[PDB]
Amino acid sequence: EESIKRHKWNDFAEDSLRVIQHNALEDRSISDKQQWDAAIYFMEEALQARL
Amino acid sequence: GFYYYQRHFVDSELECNDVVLFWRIQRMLAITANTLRQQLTNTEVRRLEKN
Amino acid sequence: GFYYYQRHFVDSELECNDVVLFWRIQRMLAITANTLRQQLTNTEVRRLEKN
């Protein structure tokens, strides 16, 4: 209990993540079959759960 | 589906662009998890040990 | 394939920045010519008649 309360996460991460996240999204280019299949896999998984 | 885009055929309904979104989000999940892990393992976990 | 260009997987795969370059300058030259023509025919020719 105590050790948790004496720790805080550095809030600046929120801004760093904002940049980093954008960069990972920024790649919109599926150049070949392998990434095409990975992309279709994740799309199928995410949509199948909601379906 | 790959021929349609080589040929630019006009009667082709199929356009596979949702694939790019979920590819991007999969990679963004990976990048966010990894950045958070690195912040944890080099900055926050040692602060936790001190606390 | 313009799509092979869009892939941009590797140099061996089609890397047609050349076609898009010559297209861009196609647009530049055509629009410059038409702008010059328009100023000529609606502004400069009537000024020429007055002079």
Side-chain angles (χ1 to χ4, degrees), chain A residues 12-34:
Chain A
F12 181 73
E14 291 182 2
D15 291 298
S16 181
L17 292 167
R18 288 175 185 106
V19 173
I20 292 167
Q21 286 155 351
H22 284 301
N23 288 342
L25 296 163
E26 189 65 29
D27 183 356
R28 297 173 182 82
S29 295
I30 301 171
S31 66
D32 206 340
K33 184 67 163 72
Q34 291 176 338

Side-chain angles (χ1 to χ4, degrees), chain A residues 6-10 13 17 20-21 24-25 27-30 33 35-36 38-40 42-43 46-47, chain B residues 1-2 16 18-29 31-32 35-36 39-40 44 47-48 51:
Chain A
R6 293 184 186 191
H7 182 229
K8 64 90 176 179
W9 203 269
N10 185 357
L17 292 167
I20 292 167
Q21 286 155 351
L25 296 163
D27 183 356
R28 297 173 182 82
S29 295
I30 301 171
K33 184 67 163 72
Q35 294 304 315
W36 186 250
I40 293 168
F42 192 68
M43 182 178 72
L47 299 179
Chain B
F2 318 94
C16 288
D18 294 358
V19 296
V20 173
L21 171 60
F22 284 98
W23 184 59
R24 290 165 72 194
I25 292 169
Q26 187 177 46
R27 298 296 299 278
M28 182 179 72
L29 292 167
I31 204 167
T32 299
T35 298
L36 293 171
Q39 291 172 355
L40 189 154
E44 300 300 352
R47 288 172 177 169
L48 179 62
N51 287 335

Side-chain angles (χ1 to χ4, degrees), chain C residues 17-34:
Chain C
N17 301 274
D18 292 331
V19 176
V20 179
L21 182 63
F22 267 99
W23 173 82
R24 285 169 72 190
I25 72 163
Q26 275 192 314
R27 296 286 293 172
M28 183 278 288
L29 293 168
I31 200 166
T32 299
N34 286 279

Side-chain angles (χ1 to χ4, degrees), chain A residues 29-31, chain B residues 5 8, chain C residues 1-9 14:
Chain A
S29 295
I30 301 171
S31 66
Chain B
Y5 314 98
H8 320 300
Chain C
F2 190 11
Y3 177 53
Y4 289 117
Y5 154 75
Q6 292 160 38
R7 297 176 64 186
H8 279 160
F9 180 48
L14 303 183

